[PDB]
Design an enzyme around this catalytic site. Structure first.
Site, PDB file in Angstrom:
ATOM      1  N   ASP A   1      14.633   0.640  -8.899  1.00 55.59           N
ATOM      2  CA  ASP A   1      13.606   1.008  -7.449  1.00 55.59           C
ATOM      3  C   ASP A   1      12.015   0.860  -7.909  1.00 55.59           C
TER       4      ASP A   1
ATOM      5  N   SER B   1       6.646   0.471  -6.270  1.00 56.99           N
ATOM      6  CA  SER B   1       7.866   1.648  -6.671  1.00 56.99           C
ATOM      7  C   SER B   1       8.133   2.140  -5.103  1.00 56.99           C
ATOM      8  CB  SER B   1       7.314   2.452  -7.567  1.00 56.99           C
ATOM      9  N   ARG B   2       9.361   2.322  -5.260  1.00 62.90           N
ATOM     10  CA  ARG B   2      10.242   2.792  -3.930  1.00 62.90           C
ATOM     11  C   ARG B   2       9.825   4.367  -3.595  1.00 62.90           C
ATOM     12  N   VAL B   3       8.813   5.038  -4.326  1.00 61.98           N
ATOM     13  CA  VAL B   3       8.548   6.228  -4.268  1.00 61.98           C
ATOM     14  C   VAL B   3       7.133   6.296  -4.609  1.00 61.98           C
ATOM     15  N   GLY B   4       5.952   6.388  -3.646  1.00 60.02           N
ATOM     16  CA  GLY B   4       4.751   6.538  -3.750  1.00 60.02           C
ATOM     17  C   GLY B   4       4.270   7.914  -3.270  1.00 60.02           C
TER      18      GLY B   4
END
Lengths: 171, 337, 52, 132, 261, 85
Positions: free
Chosen positions: B177, B202-205
């Site tokens: 991810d 990154s897929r979650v900031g």
């Protein structure tokens, strides 16, 4: 509270417009900061000035020197002493610095008073219209002597005696 | 090769000393590195670097030598998965970082193409994605139903020539991810980290970011993205105005700043400070080269002078507008002395 | 302008000597760190002997 | 500097640049400018005539159709002419008789055009005159 | 799409080479003109040095650019000086010369451009064309009555070390009564001052236009040269990518064929 | 690669120089005969010492193709020497 110790010098540099040019005071500040840096480095990087004899000697079953090593360690509790030999040098430096700074501060206060009074003798005490002309030689002690000196040798001219004034023709 | 992405991993692990070495399970992230196919000398280097900085107290480094046999290397990532299950499944938040997984792929290649199984795409075994997923997909963040624990993973893949476009690399980048691309030029051009900020993602900031870096410095995160886009165009374009040039100079000082020196993990204390000072014009006024020491001085000043505010930024969990003002005062002090 | 030349010296006599002392005595306090470094180095040497 | 320097650099092709000379006699607007050596600080717009630039060698004669010869205090004659001319190519018969007369056809234009071309009316006569 | 990129870069490189040839052809003439023009202007400059010809004090705004539409910094630097003059002297009349300078001058102040003449940079600086341009300028709206006029003209040092630098012009009033004009004398009947103003404008304009045409021909050999370098680098990179792609394709083909077998 | 390494040398006569019309168009930088001196003729070596430097300098200096007017005059003579050789 080491912030305050350099806070005074930081403020001074903030107001060192009259103190700019310190040739050998910035070097002293560098020495003081280097002492603090080495002190923090000794505190952080170096481990305890001690021995982990609680378990480490046991990990060495036949060290036969952990007893001797701990003996030397405990007997080397004071490797040496501190050196606070500054007991008259400090006094003499303090005396010189304090006398000089007091002379400076008194001179500055006297300059402040002289400027204030002269301005009080300026803001309404410059009679530019009805002051006697020759009274200038009274106010300026060399005015009379030089004016007699200026015309005396024979020269009737001065270097730019009227640089900000006009000579004018008949009209 | 020899990109020290392994060192990026090692530094990442060392951060399991400012939280794990305390006593906080909620702060605990019990890392478990891996050693998939590395020269045993490199293994010794890793062990020594773990002990000296006191990391071996929190890192289980499963090993698989290059001299070791192929089945060992192939099974090693599965062993790390098992360790991650044994930790995270217990209910404490744990972490993992698989070693160079390209060697694991080469091992799967040996296992398949050597036993009897016909090869697949890119001449590598067909189930390369299957193995890679079965490794990575083990990692997750379960809910409070399972104890709210997690096994965060940082799988490390290697290419040839920094090749982002490869079977194993691209296929894995689909599985993992987050991506942090390490180049070849920058690896010799300008940064000991040399992490391609624009390329990395990154897929979650938002969700799961340092509350210091988002709750207050979320504008600083958008400014990071904006300045990266800004430096993207900074190759041969002219000087259209002063706005672009100012953005370029400030962001370039920021980039020369942001490289956290090797084995020097110290973060959740003045993270936002770089971008905040750049936009507020505190560090940007300093010379770019001099920042290499100016940052150190500013940090030390925050430590011994802004100790209350810096410690709060460490602990309070946010850099409030009042803490922003106190940090502004500390910034004025740093600019002064 | 003479008054201005006198203006800087106003709030400087407050702490010129204070800085002269703060940067002197605290720097004089470094012999303790020196001797402590000496003992710490002795501890490192003996501890290394034990480690050997 | 001794002698006299000339700077004959027309907007077409520079001819002379500070070369020494004994005479640069030319037909000025108010008269005949026979500056031989040194001269004095005075620069004159010129009239179509002959500039027999007498160097240390012989005086080359070139019927020049205009310019200004700045007599700089350094015996420098900055003759920024508008045209160049040889001592041989500036000398001809048929080219100096039919061209002006054919141009007299242009003089049949309107008033401002004739006022302009009145200069060309006598322009070609000067070259045939100074060709000798 | 890499093949189209490589071929398009190659075509752009061929076009750049053709532009370089055209640049050489124009630069020969531009240099030929500038060689004599510089000396021509130095001739009257000797007088302006013989008599300190400082001009004090409806004041025109000018620039230097030939009949080409920008080359790297050929038109941009002059446009910046034009905008600076427009800010400083909004009521300054503009002389729109050529095309690029004409377009740049028409951009800032509509009330500034008093002329719009195109195609000045057709070839080498010709004496008669420049002289006619000046004579029209000396006749358009009493540009002689313009008390001062600054020539924001290119100053190509060696290759491109230039901008539209500004210089003064000695006018009809500033020629006769110069402080050191007492050195070189004038005649009441000869009417020197007006003729000196006109001819000073002529020599300055011819020299400046010749230098500017030479400098833009340089911009056609020092800006397209940078573009030629960019094309070379891109072509090398694309050739590397295509040669690698062809080889890798052949290798993968052999590997697939054997792996089938 | 095996043909190059096995050989005690690699006179890699690339095509590009052949395409400039040259029939025997070896590459200056690439050819390095390790044991050539042991077979070299000394008289030729006397002159080839300067030829090698001239070739290396031509390769090093032909980079500034579009900035040759401002190039050093000695560099221009070096380019002349490289071209002549």
């Amino acid at each position: 509270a080491k912030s305050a110790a350099n806070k005074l010098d930081w403020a001074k540099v903030i107001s060192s417009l009259r103190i700019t040019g310190s040739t050998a005071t910035q070097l002293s500040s560098f020495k003081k900061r280097n002492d603090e840096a080495r002190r923090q480095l000794l505190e952080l990087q170096s481990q305890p000035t001690e021995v982990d004899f609680s378990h480490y000697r046991s990990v060495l079953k036949n060290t036969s020197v952990i007893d001797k090593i701990e003996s030397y360690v405990k007997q080397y509790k004071p490797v040496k002493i501190d050196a606070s030999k500054q007991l008259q040098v400090i006094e003499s430096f303090e005396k010189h610095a304090m006398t000089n700074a007091k002379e400076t501060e008194s001179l500055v206060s006297k300059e402040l008073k002289d400027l204030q009074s002269t301005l009080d003798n300026i803001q309404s005490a410059r009679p530019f219209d009805e002051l006697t002309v020759d009274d200038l030689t009274k106010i300026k002690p060399e005015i009379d002597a030089k004016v007699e000196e200026m015309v005396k040798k024979g020269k009737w001219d001065v270097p730019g005696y009227k640089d900000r004034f006009g000579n004018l023709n008949v009209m | 090769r020899q990109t020290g992405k392994t060192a990026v991993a090692l530094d990442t692990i060392l951060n399991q000393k400012r939280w794990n070495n305390g006593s906080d399970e909620s702060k605990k992230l019990y890392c478990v590195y891996v050693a998939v196919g590395q020269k045993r000398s490199t293994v010794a280097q890793l062990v020594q670097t773990l002990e000296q900085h006191d990391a071996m107290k929190y890192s289980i480094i499963v090993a698989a030598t290059a001299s070791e046999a192929a089945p060992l290397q192939y099974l090693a990532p599965f062993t790390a998965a098992s360790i991650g299950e044994w930790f995270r499944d217990n209910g404490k938040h744990a972490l993992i970082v698989y070693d160079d997984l390209s060697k694991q792929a080469v091992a799967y290649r040996q296992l398949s193409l050597l036993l009897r199984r016909p090869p697949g795409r890119e001449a590598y075994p067909g189930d390369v994605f299957y193995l890679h997923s079965r490794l990575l997909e083990r990692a997750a963040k379960l809910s409070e139903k399972e104890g709210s624990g997690s096994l965060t993973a940082l799988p490390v893949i290697e290419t040839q020539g920094g090749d982002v476009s490869a079977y194993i690399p691209t296929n894995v980048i689909s599985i993992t991810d987050g991506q942090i691309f390490l180049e070849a030029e920058l690896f010799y051009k300008g940064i000991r980290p040399a992490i391609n900020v624009g390329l990395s993602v990154s897929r979650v900031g938002s969700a799961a970011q340092v509350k210091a870096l988002k709750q207050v410095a979320g504008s600083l995160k958008l400014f990071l993205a904006q300045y990266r886009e800004v430096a993207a165009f900074a190759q041969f374009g002219s000087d259209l105005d002063a706005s672009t040039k100012q953005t370029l100079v400030r962001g370039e000082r920021l980039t020369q700043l942001l490289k956290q020196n090797q084995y020097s993990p110290l973060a959740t204390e003045e993270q936002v400070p770089l971008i905040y000072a750049g936009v507020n014009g505190h560090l940007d006024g300093i010379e770019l080269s001099r920042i290499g020491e100016f940052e150190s001085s500013f940090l030390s000043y925050l430590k011994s002078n802004h100790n209350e505010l810096l410690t709060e930024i460490r602990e309070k969990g946010e850099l409030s507008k009042e803490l922003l003002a106190s940090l502004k005062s500390a910034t004025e002090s740093f600019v002064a002395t | 302008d003479r008054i201005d030349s006198v203006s800087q010296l106003q709030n400087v006599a407050e702490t010129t000597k204070v800085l002269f002392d703060v940067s002197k005595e605290t720097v004089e306090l470094e012999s303790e760190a020196f001797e402590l470094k000496q003992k710490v180095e002795l501890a490192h040497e003996a501890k290394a002997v034990l480690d050997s | 500097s001794s002698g006299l320097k000339l700077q004959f650099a027309l907007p077409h092709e520079t001819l002379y640049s500070g070369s020494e000379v004994t005479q640069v006699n030319l037909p000025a607007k108010s008269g005949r400018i026979g500056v031989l050596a040194n001269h004095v600080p005075t620069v004159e717009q010129l009239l179509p005539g002959v500039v027999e630039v007498m160097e240390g060698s012989n005086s080359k004669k070139f019927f020049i159709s205009g310019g200004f010869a700045t007599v700089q205090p350094d015996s420098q004659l900055c003759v920024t002419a508008i045209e160049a001319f040889p001592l041989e190519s500036f000398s001809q018969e048929n080219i100096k008789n039919l061209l002006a007369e054919a141009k007299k056809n242009v003089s049949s234009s309107d008033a401002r055009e004739a006022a302009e071309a009145a200069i060309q009316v006598e322009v070609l006569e000067n070259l045939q005159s100074v060709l000798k | 799409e890499v093949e189209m990129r490589l071929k398009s870069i190659k075509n752009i490189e061929k076009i750049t080479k053709t532009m370089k040839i055209v640049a050489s052809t124009r630069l020969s003439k531009a240099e030929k003109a500038k060689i004599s023009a510089k000396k021509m202007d130095e001739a009257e400059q000797l007088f302006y040095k013989n008599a300190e010809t400082k001009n004090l004090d409806k004041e025109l705004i000018v620039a230097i650019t030939s009949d080409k539409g920008l080359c790297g910094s050929i038109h941009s630097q002059l446009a910046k000086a034009v905008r600076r003059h427009l800010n400083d002297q909004p009521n300054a009349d503009i002389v729109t010369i050529g095309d690029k300078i004409k377009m740049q001058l028409l951009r800032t102040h509509p009330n500034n451009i008093k002329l719009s003449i195109n195609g000045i940079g057709k070839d080498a600086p010709t004496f008669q064309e420049s002289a006619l341009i000046a004579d029209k300028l000396l006749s358009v709206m009493k540009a002689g009555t313009y008390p001062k006029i600054s020539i924001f003209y290119n100053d190509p040092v060696s290759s491109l070390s230039f901008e539209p630098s500004e210089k003064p012009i000695f006018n009809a009033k500033t020629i006769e009564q110069s402080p050191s004009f007492g050195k070189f004398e004038i005649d009441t009947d000869a009417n020197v001052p007006r003729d000196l103003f006109e001819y000073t404008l002529a020599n300055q304009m011819l020299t400046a236009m010749a230098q500017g045409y030479a400098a833009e021909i340089s911009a056609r050999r020092n800006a397209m040269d940078n573009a030629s370098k960019n094309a070379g680098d891109m072509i090398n990179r694309y050739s590397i990518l295509y040669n690698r792609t062809r080889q890798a394709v052949i290798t993968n083909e052999l590997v697939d064929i054997i792996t089938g077998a």
